[PDB]
Design a protein around this motif. Sequence first.
Motif, PDB file in Angstrom:
ATOM      1  N   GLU A   1      52.662  21.406  89.950  1.00  0.00           N
ATOM      2  CA  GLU A   1      54.002  21.574  91.137  1.00  0.00           C
ATOM      3  C   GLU A   1      54.643  22.947  90.558  1.00  0.00           C
ATOM      4  O   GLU A   1      55.409  23.483  91.678  1.00  0.00           O
TER       5      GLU A   1
ATOM      6  N   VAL B   1      69.365  23.248  97.053  1.00  0.00           N
ATOM      7  CA  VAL B   1      67.961  23.832  96.919  1.00  0.00           C
ATOM      8  C   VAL B   1      66.822  23.697  96.025  1.00  0.00           C
ATOM      9  O   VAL B   1      67.447  23.476  95.199  1.00  0.00           O
ATOM     10  N   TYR B   2      66.294  22.983  96.257  1.00  0.00           N
ATOM     11  CA  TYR B   2      64.815  22.458  95.006  1.00  0.00           C
ATOM     12  C   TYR B   2      63.424  23.037  95.403  1.00  0.00           C
ATOM     13  O   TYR B   2      63.370  23.476  96.268  1.00  0.00           O
ATOM     14  N   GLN B   3      62.997  22.795  94.267  1.00  0.00           N
ATOM     15  CA  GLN B   3      61.297  23.513  94.115  1.00  0.00           C
ATOM     16  C   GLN B   3      60.364  22.339  94.839  1.00  0.00           C
ATOM     17  O   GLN B   3      60.866  21.536  94.211  1.00  0.00           O
ATOM     18  N   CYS B   4      59.335  22.293  95.538  1.00  0.00           N
ATOM     19  CA  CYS B   4      58.393  21.478  95.683  1.00  0.00           C
ATOM     20  C   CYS B   4      57.307  22.065  96.363  1.00  0.00           C
ATOM     21  O   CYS B   4      57.202  23.374  96.196  1.00  0.00           O
TER      22      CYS B   4
ATOM     23  N   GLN C   1      57.575  33.517  87.079  1.00  0.00           N
ATOM     24  CA  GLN C   1      58.429  32.854  85.899  1.00  0.00           C
ATOM     25  C   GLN C   1      58.745  33.575  84.267  1.00  0.00           C
ATOM     26  O   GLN C   1      59.601  33.711  83.767  1.00  0.00           O
ATOM     27  N   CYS C   2      57.234  33.829  84.114  1.00  0.00           N
ATOM     28  CA  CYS C   2      56.700  34.845  82.380  1.00  0.00           C
ATOM     29  C   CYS C   2      56.908  36.364  82.721  1.00  0.00           C
ATOM     30  O   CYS C   2      56.745  36.149  81.353  1.00  0.00           O
TER      31      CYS C   2
ATOM     32  N   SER D   1      62.692  33.333  77.523  1.00  0.00           N
ATOM     33  CA  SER D   1      62.070  32.483  76.995  1.00  0.00           C
ATOM     34  C   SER D   1      62.795  30.357  78.422  1.00  0.00           C
ATOM     35  O   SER D   1      63.325  31.412  78.764  1.00  0.00           O
ATOM     36  N   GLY D   2      62.130  29.887  78.245  1.00  0.00           N
ATOM     37  CA  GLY D   2      62.433  28.704  78.559  1.00  0.00           C
ATOM     38  C   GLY D   2      61.391  28.688  80.365  1.00  0.00           C
ATOM     39  O   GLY D   2      60.620  30.210  80.130  1.00  0.00           O
ATOM     40  N   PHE D   3      61.709  27.697  80.403  1.00  0.00           N
ATOM     41  CA  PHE D   3      60.854  27.124  81.770  1.00  0.00           C
ATOM     42  C   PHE D   3      61.679  26.287  82.770  1.00  0.00           C
ATOM     43  O   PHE D   3      61.288  24.831  82.250  1.00  0.00           O
ATOM     44  N   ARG D   4      61.536  26.211  84.760  1.00  0.00           N
ATOM     45  CA  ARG D   4      61.719  25.480  84.738  1.00  0.00           C
ATOM     46  C   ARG D   4      61.448  25.735  86.004  1.00  0.00           C
ATOM     47  O   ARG D   4      61.195  26.435  86.193  1.00  0.00           O
ATOM     48  N   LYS D   5      61.948  24.432  86.765  1.00  0.00           N
ATOM     49  CA  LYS D   5      61.620  24.543  88.282  1.00  0.00           C
ATOM     50  C   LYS D   5      62.590  25.158  88.828  1.00  0.00           C
ATOM     51  O   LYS D   5      63.120  25.026  88.978  1.00  0.00           O
ATOM     52  N   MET D   6      62.221  26.515  89.667  1.00  0.00           N
ATOM     53  CA  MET D   6      62.876  27.230  89.121  1.00  0.00           C
ATOM     54  C   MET D   6      62.803  27.553  91.356  1.00  0.00           C
ATOM     55  O   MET D   6      61.461  27.910  91.847  1.00  0.00           O
ATOM     56  N   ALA D   7      62.965  27.338  92.089  1.00  0.00           N
ATOM     57  CA  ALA D   7      63.188  28.350  93.619  1.00  0.00           C
ATOM     58  C   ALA D   7      63.643  29.522  93.901  1.00  0.00           C
ATOM     59  O   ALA D   7      64.128  30.176  93.168  1.00  0.00           O
ATOM     60  N   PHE D   8      63.748  30.203  95.130  1.00  0.00           N
ATOM     61  CA  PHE D   8      62.828  31.595  95.366  1.00  0.00           C
ATOM     62  C   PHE D   8      65.130  31.618  95.757  1.00  0.00           C
ATOM     63  O   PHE D   8      65.629  30.137  96.525  1.00  0.00           O
TER      64      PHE D   8
END
Lengths: 301, 301
Positions: free
Chosen positions: A290, A125-128, A299-300, A1-8
């Motif tokens: 995004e 590092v960030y996702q966009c 991610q799931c 569980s959980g949902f984050r803005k995840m980068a590679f």
Amino acid sequence: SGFRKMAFPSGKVEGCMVQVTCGTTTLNGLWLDDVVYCPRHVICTSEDMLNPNYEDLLIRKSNHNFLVQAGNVQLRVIGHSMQNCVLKLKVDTANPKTPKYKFVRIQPGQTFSVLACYNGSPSGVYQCAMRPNFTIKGSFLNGSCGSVGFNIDYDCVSFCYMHHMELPTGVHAGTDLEGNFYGPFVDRQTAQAAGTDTTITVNVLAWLYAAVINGDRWFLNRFTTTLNDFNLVAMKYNYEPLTQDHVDILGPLSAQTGIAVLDMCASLKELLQNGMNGRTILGSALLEDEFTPFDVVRQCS
Amino acid sequence: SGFRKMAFPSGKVEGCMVQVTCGTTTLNGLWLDDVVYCPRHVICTSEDMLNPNYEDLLIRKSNHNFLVQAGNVQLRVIGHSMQNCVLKLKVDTANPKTPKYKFVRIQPGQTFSVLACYNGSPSGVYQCAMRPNFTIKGSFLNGSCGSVGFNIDYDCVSFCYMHHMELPTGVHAGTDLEGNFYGPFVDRQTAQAAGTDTTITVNVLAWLYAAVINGDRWFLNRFTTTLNDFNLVAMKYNYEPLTQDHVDILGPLSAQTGIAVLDMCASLKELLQNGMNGRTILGSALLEDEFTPFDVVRQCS
Ligand SMILES: *CCC(=O)N(c1ccc(C(C)(C)C)cc1)[C@@H](C(=O)NCCc1cccc(F)c1)c1cccnc1
Ligand SMILES: [Cl-]
């Protein structure tokens, strides 16, 4: 569980970051095989940036004017050429850490990871996402030019973005790795502005599916809508039109949750007309755009 | 300009991720020098997850029962020991990619990057905070145990978290790299629940300073407050008490923006009272608490 803005994971890209210095300007370069890629505005002085003739400024440079630093080692420049808004510095050493890579041009709505760098040193590092107005809502300070955006697929790094500049609204503009700008921007010190932005509809729907998968269902309703009625609603709220391709792309998420795409559209329509009414979705009071359908599935799973 | 939830570049940690297999269980390990660190629940049987006696389970194992895989290479286990809730597998090969590192135990409110892994293979990187209730709101699926949280300071990786489990509310619990759990959690399938969570006040204030640094001042007011009056109001909204240490820690941000900490506290009190009235602060309709004063100083101009 959980949902984050995840980068590679950024490791494959960190091993390619170098510092490029030309005159008084220092920015980042991407060292792949024996070539260092960087914004061509590194050859611009204070005077030049206003009306630069890059071909005229480049012909005045020699290889030894470009100082390339990979960690604590100086790379020797043995050639230089320009491809659109990207400068290609041929170096004497091939990068032993060169990953398997491709240069890809992405479309608005697609997401990517950015490895923000300063002085050739990775900082974060960030996702966009590439906004529909071709800007990115990144996080960059002076010295971040040359930082890259990428996606990873089966150990292959797809480089899609190179940072060039910040617009007056705090958003960012850059090119693909072939030096073609995303958006109607130029690498000049001139009046430039981000156009009016829109919400990436397919991405909001994907994120609503991610919320359902994670147990957030309060926004679901018994209703459905036609694609045309949904788009008449969407255009009123500055949302990008939803096409049949977007509906097809959302198919797997629809089959997993049992919520038809047009049924999720009736939920989005109600959220747009009524608001969230004190409730949140995946810890957000705004409709998040995004995360692509692929990002949600990745991610799931 | 810009403000993103930014993770540290994960490369130094990616080079430490290995797969640990014990019987039918596969999870992640952290290979530093000649030791592989992983959750001790890897030895736990499926028939007894409720009341495992780890000392009794471990004494029945030999070195060759633990299969460690680093990429496509099998590492040979030559020793094993338990330290609190972590198993330390001595291997015959030192990791050539071992970065400069420290094991640090963090306090609630602190943030870190998580490199989510499955089968010893890095999947994604995201930014987290240790919640006041000692849980983390991560994004982890089955097989993510052994994934680590870390910060980077001048090429030194500070490992602060190892993922052990998901609590019934979807939040996550784990240990520091010495095997001591954060919070009152145990590596047993017993009735455990995360305590009531609260908002990290010092972090919201830091984020309000980040908004001022980026040009947003709409939320400020002509008022100030005492620390005690601020805390009486803060507790009513489930906010953590703000201590004199937090006020001292906010000093640099206060000096840079010219806004006294107790003046910013008066702004936060007003935001709690009125909400945002359709506005956002750094692209958010909620008061963000997963950026520390240090994170704001690191990322902002
Ligand atoms: C790595 C194993 C895993 O995926 N687990 C898991 C962790 C720990 C355990 C025990 C220590 C043996 C109980 C079992 C399984 C997932 C998980 O935490 N499942 C819930 C088990 C549980 C732990 C603590 C209290 C409780 F009430 C139930 C898992 C799933 C998703 C993300 N991380 C871990
Ligand atoms: Cl700490």
